[PDB]
Amino acid sequence: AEMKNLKIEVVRYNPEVDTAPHSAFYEVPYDATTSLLDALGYIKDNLAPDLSYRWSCRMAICGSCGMMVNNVPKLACKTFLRDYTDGMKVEALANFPIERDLVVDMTHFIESLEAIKPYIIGNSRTADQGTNIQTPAQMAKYHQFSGCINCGLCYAACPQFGLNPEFIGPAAITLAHRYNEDSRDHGKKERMAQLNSQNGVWSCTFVGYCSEVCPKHVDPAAAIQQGKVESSKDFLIATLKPR
Amino acid sequence: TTKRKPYVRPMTSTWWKKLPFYRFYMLREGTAVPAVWFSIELIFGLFALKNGPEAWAGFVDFLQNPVIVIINLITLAAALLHTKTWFELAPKAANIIVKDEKMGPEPIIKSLWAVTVVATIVILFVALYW
Amino acid sequence: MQTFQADLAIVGAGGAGLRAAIAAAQANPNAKIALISKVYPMRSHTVAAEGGSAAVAQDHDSFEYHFHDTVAGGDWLCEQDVVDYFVHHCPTEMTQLELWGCPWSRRPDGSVNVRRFGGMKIERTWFAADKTGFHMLHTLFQTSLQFPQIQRFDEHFVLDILVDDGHVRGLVAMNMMEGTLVQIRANAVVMATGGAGRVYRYNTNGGIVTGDGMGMALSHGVPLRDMEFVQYHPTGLPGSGILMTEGCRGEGGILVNKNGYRYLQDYGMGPETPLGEPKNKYMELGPRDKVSQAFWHEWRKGNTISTPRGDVVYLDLRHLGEKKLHERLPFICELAKAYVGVDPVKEPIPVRPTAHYTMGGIETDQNCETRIKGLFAVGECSSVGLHGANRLGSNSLAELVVFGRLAGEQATERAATAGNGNEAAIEAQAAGVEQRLKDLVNQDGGENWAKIRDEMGLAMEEGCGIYRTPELMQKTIDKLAELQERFKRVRITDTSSVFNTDLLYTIELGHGLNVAECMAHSAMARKESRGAHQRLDEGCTERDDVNFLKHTLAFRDADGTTRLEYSDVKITTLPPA
Amino acid sequence: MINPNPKRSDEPVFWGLFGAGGMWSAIIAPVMILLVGILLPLGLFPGDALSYERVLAFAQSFIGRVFLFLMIVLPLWCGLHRMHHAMHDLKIHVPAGKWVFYGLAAILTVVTLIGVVTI
C-alpha cells in the first residue's frame, strides 16, 4: 500500500557545535500504530544517525522516554503520530538542562529521590519469622503512590520546579509519602526534615499539572497535599515539644 | 575538559500565558483580589455602621454606584469560581480507605457543596425572613 | 584512563545486580562496591515482569514439588544440585523483599497471596498485581540506597573486563554523558547484564537486552552454555512483540482462530473447558510449547487472522468482566488499548508467539563463578544450570534474588583472598580496550549498522524459531557469518562525545552477532528435540537422553569461529526416565 | 548537592490560616456577597430586613460580632497569602514581601478587632 508521511520537528542540540538548540525537520512514514519512539528510531536509522535519545521498554513501564511534545510532557513510546497530523514538535524534557538532543540531566531528580530515604526503615523483623502481615485495607493507603516509574514528566509539568530548581519535586515527595504511609515502615521522622523544608512540600502551590500528566496515574499532587497536612501536624507537635 | 555545553532554557514571567491549564491556574489564584476587596468593603460598611445612619446611608449609596455594582458582581463570580475549584482540590488532602479502596474525591466534593447549599439557604433566611 | 578502586565491581543494576550489591554491602560493611549500569537502575528490564516470582508458600507444598517441577520443565538438562539450592532459598528471598517493602498482593488476613504459573500443580507464585517486576526492581533499587558501600556509576557502558593469568582485575567502561573511558579495578566482577532476546526481530525485551555481558565473557575464553534454548511466549502483540501475560488466560481468556474456534483442542490439549472454569494443563492453559506450536499449525492450515502487522490469533477476554479485568489485569488492558487499540472488555486482542527469555548464558559453577577466577555471572545473562532446556514460569525473577545474593557473598570472599596481579599487564589490558575502541571508531566502509541489525533479527526469527530444520538453521548460520563480515565495514558517522548512542548501539550490535552465532551453531548441532529446541528433521524430532543429555558449551576463538564442547548434567534424586 | 539538614519552614502557620480562611470563604462568602453587594443596595429584600437599625442590631449582638470578625478576617488571611505567592509566580520582586502581606493582614485584623469590640 501507501503510508502517509508526517513532517516532524525535532529540536536538536550538540554541545560541541551548537551555541543553542535548533529545530530540524524529518519526513517520517506512519500509520494508526506508529508511536513517537517508533518515529525517533526511523529517523536515527535512515535520516540522522546522530539523533540521540533515551528509551528501552517500548511499553511505558520503564520510564526513560520522557520528552516534550507540542509543549506537553509525554512518553515517546505512548505518543502516536496519528494524533499530530497538523504538526508535531519534539523537544527535551522541560525544566532540565539539555545535555544533547533529547537527553537531559536527570541528576537533580535522582538526588532528590535519594534524599527522602525511599526504603523501609526501622522494622526489625527477619526473613525466618516470615513476612509482615499487611491487609488489603492497609496497602490501599499507599498503593497508588507506589506506581511511579520515575519518568520525570511531573517535573517538566510543575511550574514551581521550573521556578525553584531546588524544590525536591512531586515524585520525590510522593515516593516519601509512599513509605510514610506503608504500615511496615517506621522511619517517618527520618523523612520529615526534607518534606518540611521550604524546598519540600511547601514549595508546591497545587498547580496540579503533575497529576495531569502522570502516565501511571499516581496523582503526586494528592500525595503532596497529604504531605502538607502531615508536615503541619509535625510543626505543631514540634511547637508543643519543649521537652 | 568536558565537551558538554548544557543549555538551560530561561523561564519568563509570562510562562503561564502559554498553556490553558496554567492560565486557569492563574485565574484561580486571581480570585484572591476580589476576595480581599470584599473584605475591605466589609470593613467600610462596618465602620460606617458605627458612625450612624448618616454614614451607613453613605455606604449603601456607594454600593449603588453601579460601577461598584459591576465590580461586586465580578466579585461574586470570582467567589464562586473559588468555591468551585476549592471543593475540587480540598478532598486531595484526605487519604480515606473504604473497604480496601482509597475513595474520594466525589463523595467529599458532594458533601461540601451540600453544606454550602444549606448554609446559603440558612443565611438568606435569617437575613431576610425575620 | 582515570582509575577507581573497588572491592567488587557489579556490572548491571537489574534484579540480580542490585540483590548482589546489597548482599555484598551486608556481608562486608567496609566494602567499596562499584555498581555499574548503562541506564539508571530502575530502567533495567526486570521492571517489565508481570507474572510473578515463585517460592514455596502453601502448607500443602514442598520444596520437592517445586524441585520436580523445575527439573521436569527443564527436560532434565538441569544441574539438579543447583535446582535444590534454588528451591530451598526462594522462600527466604521473597519474604526478604517483603521486609524491604515490596507490596505483594495479599489475602484478606494480610498474608501474602500466590497464584499459578508455569503450569505448576501447586500455586506458588508471589505477585504484585501484574506489575511484579516493577515492584521488585524498585524495592531492590530503593533498598540499596541505604548502603554507602554501593557507589553507583549510572549510565556507564562497560566495554570489556580485564583478565590476566586466569583472574579478573577490573573492567573498562565509558562514561556515557562525558564520553570518557574509565578504569575500575577489582578482584571480583559480577556479570548481571541480562539475556539477549534482542537478537530476534520480534521479542518482549527492552532495547537494552542486547547480551553485552555474554559477548564480553565470550571474548575471554569463557563459554556460553545451552544457548540454543530460546523461550518464546505464546501471547505477544503483533509488531511490537509486547507481552500479554499468561494471566489473561489464568483468568479465563481464550485463544481462537479466524473461525472463532478454540483450536487448542485439536492439538491434544482437549477436551474444551467451559468459558467459566479454565483448568490448568488444558486448552489455553496447556504446555507452553504446545500452545506456541498450535499457532504454527493453525497458520499452516490458514486459520490465522491476517492483519497489517502480521498473522495472529485472538486472545478473547470479554467474558472476564470489568471487576476481574481491572482488579487483576489493569496493565494488560492499558497495553492492549494503547498499542493495538483494543479494549479487552469490548474486543479480542490480536496475538502471536514472541521471542522472550534467554535460557542459555555465561557458564557458571554452583556459586555463579566462571572459568576465570574472580569472574561471576548471575541473572539472565548466566547459566547456573537452573532452567535446563525450558525455564519454568516465575522462576526467573526468583532466580535473580536467590542467586543474586549468592553471587554477592561469593564475590566478596573471592576478592578478599584474591591477592595481587601484574600491574603492567592489567594496565596493558586497559590500553587494549581503548585501542580497540579507537579501531572501531576509525572504521569506515559505508555500511549502516541498523540494516545489519534488522537482518540479524530476521535471521534468528526464520532459522531459530519455534520449529527448526537443518536447512533453515544452516541458512541462518550462513547469514550471521555474512553479517559479521559486514560488521567490519560499518562506519559510525557520529564522532561526538556527549551521549553518543550511535556508537553504543553499534557496539551492542557486535555482541549480538557473536551471541547469535553461539545460539545458531548450538542449535544446529543439537540433533534432538528438547524443551525449547524442537526440530522437524528425521532422527531429531524426539528427546535423545542417550546421546544428548548434555549441556552445549559454545566458545568463540580469536579467529572468529564458534566451537562447541559438551558437558554432563548433574543428576541427584531424579533420574531421566 | 541537596543540603543534608535543611532549615524547617514556617509556612505551616500561614498555610494553616489560609486553610481555615479558604474554607470559610468557600462556604459562606458567596451568600454574603449576594446579600451585601447585591440584594442590599438593590432593595431586593423584605421590608426592613437590611435596614440600618436591623443591621446594627445584629452587628452589636455577640454572635454578630464574632461572625463579622471571621467573615472579614479569615478571607484576608487566605487572600493575602495567595497574593504573596502570586508575586513569586509572576516573578515580581517585593521587598520584605512576607512582612508586607502578612503584616497588612495583621493590621487589618486588628483594625477589624477594634471595629467589632465596637465603635
Ligand SMILES: *Cc1cc2c(cc1C)nc1c(=O)[nH]c(=O)nc-1n2C[C@H](O)[C@H](O)[C@H](O)COP(=O)(O)OP(=O)(O)OC[C@H]1O[C@@H](n2cnc3c(N)ncnc32)[C@H](O)[C@@H]1O
Ligand atoms: C522480557 C520479560 C522478562 C520476564 C517477564 C516479562 C518480560 C516482558 N516476566 C517474568 C515473570 O513474570 N516472572 C519471572 O520469573 N521472570 C520474568 N521475566 C524474565 C526475567 O524478568 C528476566 O530474565 C530478568 O529480569 C533479568 O534480570 P537481570 O538482573 O538478569 O537483568 P536485567 O533486568 O535484564 O538488566 C540488565 C542490567 O545490566 C546493565 N547492562 C547491560 N549491558 C551493559 C553494559 N554493556 N555496560 C554497563 N551495564 C550494562 C543494564 O543497564 C541493566 O542494569
Ligand SMILES: CCCCCCCCCCCCOCCOCCOCCOCCOCCOCCOCCOCCO
Ligand atoms: C502590627 C503589625 C504587626 C505586623 C505583624 C506581621 C506579622 C507577619 C509575620 C510574618 C513573619 C515573617 O518572617 C519573616 C522573616 O523571613 C524569614 C522566614 O523564615 C522564618 C523565620 O521566622 C520568622 C520571623 O518573624 C517572626 C514574627 O514575630 C511577630 C511580630 O510581632 C510584632 C508585634 O508588634 C508590636 C510592637 O509595637
Ligand SMILES: C[C@H](c1ccc(Cl)cc1)c1cc([N+](=O)[O-])cc([N+](=O)[O-])c1O
Ligand atoms: C491541599 C491544600 C489545602 C489547604 C487548605 C485546606 Cl482547608 C484544605 C487543603 C491546598 C489547596 C489548594 N487549593 O487551591 O485548593 C492550594 C494549596 N496551595 O498551596 O496553593 C494547598 O496547600
Ligand SMILES: O=C([O-])CC(=O)C(=O)O
Ligand atoms: O510472562 C509471564 O507472565 C510468565 C512467564 O512465562 C515468565 O515468567 O516470563
Ligand code: SF4
Ligand atoms: S509521578 Fe508520574 S510523572 Fe512523576 S515521575 Fe512518577 S510516574 Fe513520572
Ligand code: F3S
Ligand atoms: S504541578 Fe507542582 S505545584 Fe504542586 S501540584 Fe504538582 S507539585
Ligand code: FES
Ligand atoms: S521506553 Fe519505557 S517509558 Fe518509553
